């Protein structure tokens, strides 16, 4: 059906652009990571986006084969955890970057005397650690079933008739993955614009464009994935609404993936002399 074709074409476009974009960004950032502190913020984000993009054809073939898993049992229990880890790290890195800019604008004196390069590495490590702590539930509760009807095999989640654990995990993921980063991002940027446009010397029109682009892209392209996920989590495995939502899973997955393509473009476009920095290395 139409959702399958739309998801496939979106996946192809996102892969084709994002692989090259993230490779270029990480190559440019690697050379400058030693001198500038701003580079090592985007280095981790580029690495995470690159790893996320490399995992696209695993889903691309799985869509074609009508949800068939030829990899095996251990791969079914290892791979999805890592592919989710990449997304969560990518979200937390953007949240941390916004917090870093907010702390640069306010309290300017403190960030001059007592800010270096180790703090950014510590923050990135903390972001990855929270991503791992959030992705560990997927390790435990993933099992496989074989169909002794005409041969299929399926990866899914079985809670052994324990709805409370499933609902609690869904609530924790929803709260710690969508609402908190959005709130922090929006508050930080609105304060940034207010304080920046307060005075004449710091007033410019580029901050508004960058902020609006980032926030609008994040919200618009991450809302459907989360809402469909939570709706599917609350429902029982046998319902017509469950089937209808199953008809639209891959569209939501691709619509969430497009953010990995969108993110690295802003750094190149809104950067000062990126062409010269590339020519240097």
């Amino acid at each position: 059906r139409v959702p399958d074709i739309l998801a496939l074409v979106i996946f192809a476009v996102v892969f084709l652009v994002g692989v090259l974009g993230n490779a270029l960004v990480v190559w440019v950032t690697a050379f400058e990571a030693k001198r500038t502190i701003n580079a090592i913020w985007f280095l981790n984000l580029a690495v995470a986006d690159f790893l996320s993009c490399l995992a696209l054809p695993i889903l691309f073939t799985s869509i074609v084969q009508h949800h068939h898993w030829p990899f095996g049992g251990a791969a079914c229990s290892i791979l999805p955890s890592l592919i989710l880890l990449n997304m969560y790290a990518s979200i937390l890195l953007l949240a941390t970057i916004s917090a870093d800019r907010f702390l640069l604008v306010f309290k300017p004196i403190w960030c001059q005397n007592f800010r270096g390069a180790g703090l950014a590495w510590i923050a990135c490590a903390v972001a990855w650690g929270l991503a791992l702590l959030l992705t560990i539930p997927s390790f435990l509760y993933r099992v496989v079933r074989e169909e002794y009807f005409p041969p299929k095999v399926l990866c899914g989640v079985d809670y052994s008739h324990d709805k409370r654990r499933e609902r609690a995990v869904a609530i924790v993921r929803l709260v710690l993955g969508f609402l908190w980063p959005l709130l922090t991002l929006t508050i930080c940027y609105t304060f940034i614009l207010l304080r920046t446009w307060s005075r004449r010397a710091t007033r410019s029109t580029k901050t508004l464009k960058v902020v609006v682009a980032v926030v609008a892209s994040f919200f618009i392209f991450w809302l459907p994935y989360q809402v469909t996920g939570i709706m599917m989590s609350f429902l029982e495995p046998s319902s017509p609404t469950f089937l209808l939502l199953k008809k639209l899973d891959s569209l939501c997955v691709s619509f969430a993936y497009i953010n990995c393509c969108i993110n690295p473009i802003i750094y190149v476009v809104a950067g000062q002399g990126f062409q010269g920095r590339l020519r240097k290395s």
Binding site: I58, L59, S62, H67, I83, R145, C155, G156, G229, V253
Partner: peptide
């Protein structure tokens, strides 16, 4: 058992 695919 839930048919949740790769990703979610």
């Amino acid at each position: 058992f839930k048919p949740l695919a790769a990703x979610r």
